[PDB]
Structure 1
Amino acid sequence: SFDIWKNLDRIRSTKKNAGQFIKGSLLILPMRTEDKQQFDECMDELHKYISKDILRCYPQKMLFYIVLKDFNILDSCFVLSVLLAFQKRLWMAPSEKSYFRVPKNINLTGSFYLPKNIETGSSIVEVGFNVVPDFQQFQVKACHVSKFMNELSNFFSQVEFGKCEANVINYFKREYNRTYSQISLALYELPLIGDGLFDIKSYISKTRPIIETSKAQMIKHISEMKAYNEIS
């Protein structure tokens, strides 16, 4: 039963009023794409049902910030399932090109960010050491077809948000862009480490005698250990 519509009906049947929307709820899922026209077709197919108010995207100027505001419990599982299934399908079976059908053996895997001012009080874990300062990042692993939806319901039925800022989304965009520009620059300094931007000429004239005396101490230590070892 790897069909999102049947799974949605199943979760609607017995998740105790999952259609009710969380007050002040916000979820940000940044994603990347290598083809634009197929992701756009998938996004129109998504928008025809998700409605424009709940779900919105900001193409950064390739990055697509998919943002959920005031999302319903049932709608969250649907959007995450469709989006993660498409993002995985881009590489696994690019020949099927079916959007609302998840082929078997595909395991959902991804990440989504939540505002830091949320309180928690087995398949979805919060991650330590998050680079984004004011956001909490989560990871989804080992998901079949119904296990992911059940875990999402059991997780979002518990967590609760509070008093989100008016323009937190722009802050997230700015901070993500800053961190990835930083890593791009970090890769850009790779070739120039040697004397390119490091003042090696006067570095060496200071660090030469220390290395020389360290070499002398090393050879003395080896001789001393050899004499300690052999009986001779």
Structure 2
Amino acid sequence: QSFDIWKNLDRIRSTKKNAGQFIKGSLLILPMRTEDKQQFDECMDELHKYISKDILRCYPQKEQKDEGMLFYIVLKDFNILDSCFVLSVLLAFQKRLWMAPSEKSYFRVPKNINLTGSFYLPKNIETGSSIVEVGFNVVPDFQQFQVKACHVSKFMNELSNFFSQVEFGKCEANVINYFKREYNRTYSQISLALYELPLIGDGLFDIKSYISKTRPIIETSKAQMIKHISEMKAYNEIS
């Protein structure tokens, strides 16, 4: 179909067989990044007008990087449609900066683009394609989901086909503070792993005693390989 969100959304309103009544205890958190805040605020303000404030909140982080802002997008108690609308708008908008810098209309999504991102659900889901789970997810409680490179209409269609199946249950009130704290712990760990990239040899490894501990074994190893090559040369030699 078309590349206007509203025609796809009215299609998915009409044909989806109780597309209205919501999902019990359903919470979805999608952490997204932007280089500039002022482009983001217009999309999020129009988005806030259409969707009830209780349903969708935007939690800014502490601005620790001060360059790339990390805004959490949380949809609590969403319907089968509200999810499709917010995901289509935000998944297009965070890719609008790179590919289509001239079009500039936050609810119409041009046809050169494909929607690609990732969202987190709680682990206590029961599911009883274009959206797949991940193996080896890194946040200790939540289930990272991947959406791989679809049109806008196939994105709406597959989001409705996905959220029909899933069945949430019984999280805490402030589980969102738990996700904020946990995701910030994980990227603080990988940032502080990149800060150890110069400091390997003698920065924090007491290399002065490590070299004296593994100097003779490298030396005997080199002896064994020289002996290996002479032995193998005598094995291959016709003589």
CA-CA distance at 1:138 after TM superposition: 0.2
Q: Which runs of 4+ in 1 moved over 2 A?
A: none
When the two chains are superposed, the root-mean-square deviation of aligned CA atoms in Å is 1.3
Deviation track 1:115-172 (CA, whole Å, cap 9, x = no partner) reads 0111122100000000101000000012112111110011000000001111110000
The gaps in structure 1 that reach 5 residues or longer are: none
Contact 2:35/2:68 (8 A) holds in 1: no
- Please give the alpha-carbon distance, in whole angstroms, between the structure 2 residues aligned to 1:111 and 1:230: 60
Contact 1:109/1:143 (8 A) holds in 2: yes
CA-CA distance at 1:61 after TM superposition: 11
CA-CA distance at 1:96 after TM superposition: 1.5
Contact 2:36/2:68 (8 A) holds in 1: no
Contact 1:28/1:112 (8 A) holds in 2: yes
Deviation track 1:189-224 (CA, whole Å, cap 9, x = no partner) reads 000001111000000001000000000000000000
The total of aligned residue pairs comes to 232
Contact 1:105/1:144 (8 A) holds in 2: no
- Please give the alpha-carbon distance, in whole angstroms, between the structure 1 residues aligned to 2:127 and 2:14: 26
CA-CA distance at 1:94 after TM superposition: 1.6
Contact 2:3/2:111 (8 A) holds in 1: yes
Identity percentage over the alignment? 99
- Please give the alpha-carbon distance, in whole angstroms, between the structure 1 residues aligned to 2:221 and 2:13: 71
Q: TM-score, normalised by structure 2?
A: 0.95
Contact 1:110/1:139 (8 A) holds in 2: yes
CA-CA distance at 1:55 after TM superposition: 0.3
The gaps in structure 2 that reach 5 residues or longer are: 61-66
Specify the SS of the correspondent of 1:15: coil
CA-CA distance at 1:84 after TM superposition: 0.3
